[PDB]
UniProtKB/Swiss-Prot annotation:
Gene name tied to this protein: ARIH1
Protein name (record): E3 ubiquitin-protein ligase ARIH1
Binding site for Zn(2+) 5: C22, C25, C40, C45
Full-sequence range covered: 325 to 396 of 557
Tissue: Widely expressed.
Entry function: E3 ubiquitin-protein ligase, which catalyzes ubiquitination of target proteins together with ubiquitin-conjugating enzyme E2 UBE2L3. Acts as an atypical E3 ubiquitin-protein ligase by working together with cullin-RING ubiquitin ligase (CRL) complexes and initiating ubiquitination of CRL substrates: associates with CRL complexes and specifically mediates addition of the first ubiquitin on CRLs targets. The initial ubiquitin is then elongated by CDC34/UBE2R1 and UBE2R2. E3 ubiquitin-protein ligase activity is activated upon binding to neddylated cullin-RING ubiquitin ligase complexes.
Residues noted as binding Zn(2+) 6 in the record, renumbered to the chain: C50, C53, H60, C67
RING-type zinc finger segments: 22-53
Top-level taxon of origin: Eukaryota
Induction or repression: Up-regulated following DNA damage.
Native source organism of the sequence: Homo sapiens
Length: 74
């Protein structure tokens, strides 16, 4: 299956389902796996956002805004 090492981001053959980008500047990022506190890697951005829905992390930080990681209530 892995002919190469998927090291090339240019192809984006892996990012298609193994990674996502910043919803603000659209820079290739990578989920940590912790408390969902995802922050941009772009030094010209560094915006913190909810990786799950790719929305603002600020309302998600126990403020009032709830989100659905893998279990949707919808
Ligand atoms: Zn960004
Ligand atoms: Zn969210």
């Amino acid at each position: 299956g892995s002919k190469k090492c998927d090291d090339d981001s240019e192809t984006s053959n892996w990012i298609a389902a193994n990674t996502k980008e910043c919803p603000k500047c659209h820079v290739t990022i990578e989920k940590d796996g912790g408390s969902n506190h995802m922050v941009c890697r772009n030094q010209n951005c560094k915006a913190e956002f909810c990786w799950v829905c790719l929305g603002p992390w600020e309302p998600h930080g126990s403020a009032w805004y709830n989100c659905n990681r893998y279990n949707e209530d919808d």
